[PDB]
Write an enzyme that holds these catalytic residues in place. Structure first.
Site, PDB file in Angstrom:
ATOM      1  N   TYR A 141      -8.683  -0.921  -5.015  1.00  0.00           N
ATOM      2  CA  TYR A 141      -8.887  -0.835  -3.577  1.00  0.00           C
ATOM      3  C   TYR A 141      -7.676  -1.323  -2.849  1.00  0.00           C
ATOM      4  CZ  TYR A 141     -11.206  -1.783   0.882  1.00  0.00           C
ATOM      5  OH  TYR A 141     -11.616  -1.808   2.225  1.00  0.00           O
ATOM      6  N   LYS A 145      -5.330   1.033  -0.436  1.00  0.00           N
ATOM      7  CA  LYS A 145      -5.187   0.792   0.994  1.00  0.00           C
ATOM      8  C   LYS A 145      -3.767   0.340   1.357  1.00  0.00           C
ATOM      9  CE  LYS A 145      -9.427   1.629   2.071  1.00  0.00           C
ATOM     10  NZ  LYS A 145      -9.812   2.551   3.219  1.00  0.00           N
TER      11      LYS A 145
END
Ligand SMILES: CCC(C)(C)C(=O)C(=O)N1CCCC[C@H]1C(=O)N[C@H](CCc1ccc(OC)cc1)C(=O)NC[C@@H]1CC12CCN(c1nc(N[C@@H](CC(C)C)c3nc[nH]n3)nc(N3CCn4ncnc4C3)n1)CC2
Ligand SMILES: [Cl-]
Lengths: 235, 107
Positions: A141, A145
């Site tokens: 993640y 991002k």
């Protein structure tokens, strides 16, 4: 506004964007893994391990839907969440999921923006405040991002391909107030979760030219006791 | 929505829970029986986690009803599958889908 493409149009935030924008009688296209019956038109992405296959297919389908018409905004709101540190037996599968849901989607959206955004139009990208720092318990993640935040910086640069006067802005929330989150984390302080309608109304302002940040901005979205504040972060 | 018909029974006691990963082999067909995909053609089972919005609603509701070792036919209306638009190039508009699903194990 008048034409918006919601990339991730069946997700929680993207479904609210489709509903709100249709209530204003905007033309709204959804790109997702399945249709959004509320949208003006829906494009369905192919499940595949080949990034070029998926990206070429979406690009061709969006180009056929729009023809020579340009859009006022592309709201890339896709992204999921899957956790785990670097030793986790689930690391590789969760990284693959995260890269597909955030890196692939943002990249395709950015290409669509160069081809289809009106001059002065808006591309939003879905970042994460947590990826401003290390994310030891959510490796994939954070990497995904962090890549989106960097991409936003690239799109603001000279000769990135963005049309004249258009802006790419990344949105960096913590947790959104969604039905799936309320049932997944029923003991959390919901008043630190961001209402979806706060982001929908922010996007509407930005698309229409009200209080629009500069291209390349990383806008942190932080809710404290039900009140949401927007704060720039600098890459 | 989704009709579940037993082709062969499972153990009748190990049913999936949210958070568990279902391991399945499937064949998907259109209502006329035309096959559009099978995990068996890849010799590799499909895996998904219930409760994570990973699959069409007919599978989310259908597979949750199955026990380990069961083989079931799921007949899924378009509103529980790909709806009015379908998936151009593979699933026609407003298609009812039929999946032969075998729940191999839970992980
Ligand atoms: C191989 C397929 C063929 C046709 C041959 C087949 O036989 C067939 O039919 N099946 C195969 C056998 C099982 C039956 C059936 C089936 O179910 N197949 C699914 C197809 C995907 C699907 C369809 C309806 C759904 O309803 C809940 C959910 C999923 C599959 O392969 N699932 C597993 C593969 C690994 C994923 C992809 C990544 N991952 C995911 N989840 C969400 N949630 C969305 C919101 C959600 C509520 C829609 C989101 N969240 C932020 N925004 N939107 N979005 C995305 N996107 C990334 C791409 N992208 N591009 C723009 N927007 C996005 C958002 N990716 C989880 C699942
Ligand atoms: Cl972390």
């Amino acid at each position: 506004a008048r034409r918006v493409l919601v990339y991730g149009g069946r997700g929680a935030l993207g479904s609210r964007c489709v509903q709100a924008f249709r209530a204003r009688n905007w033309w709204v296209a959804s790109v997702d893994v399945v249709e959004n019956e509320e949208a003006s038109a829906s494009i369905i992405v192919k499940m595949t391990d080949s990034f070029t296959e998926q990206a070429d297919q979406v690009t061709a389908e969006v180009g056929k839907l729009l023809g020579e018409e340009k859009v006022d905004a592309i709201l890339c709101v896709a992204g999921g969440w899957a956790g785990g540190n670097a030793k986790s037996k689930s690391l590789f599968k969760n990284c693959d999921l995260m890269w597909k849901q955030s890196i692939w989607t943002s990249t395709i959206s950015s290409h669509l923006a160069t081809k289809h955004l009106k001059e002065g139009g808006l591309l939003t990208l879905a970042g994460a405040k947590a990826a401003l720092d290390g994310t030891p318990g959510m490796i994939g993640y954070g990497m995904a991002k962090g890549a989106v935040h960097q991409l936003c910086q690239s799109l603001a640069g000279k000769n990135s391909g963005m049309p004249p006067g258009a802006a790419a802005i990344a949105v960096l929330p913590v947790t959104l107030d969604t039905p799936m989150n309320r049932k997944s984390m029923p003991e959390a302080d919901f008043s630190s979760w961001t209402p979806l309608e706060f982001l929908v109304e922010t996007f509407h302002d930005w698309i229409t030219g009200k209080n629009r940040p500069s291209s390349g901005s990383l806008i942190q979205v932080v809710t404290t006791e039900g009140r949401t504040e927007l704060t720039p972060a600098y890459f | 929505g989704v009709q579940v018909e037993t082709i062969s029974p499972g153990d009748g006691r190990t049913f999936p829970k949210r958070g568990q990963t279902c391991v399945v082999h499937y064949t998907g067909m259109l209502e006329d029986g035309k096959k559009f995909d099978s995990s068996r053609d890849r010799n590799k089972p499909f895996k998904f986690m219930l409760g994570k919005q990973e699959v069409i609603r007919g599978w989310e509701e259908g597979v949750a009803q199955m026990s380990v070792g069961q083989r079931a036919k799921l007949t899924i209306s378009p509103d529980y599958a790909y709806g009015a638009t379908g998936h151009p190039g593979i699933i026609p508009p407003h298609a009812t889908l039929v999946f032969d699903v075998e729940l191999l194990k839970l992980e």
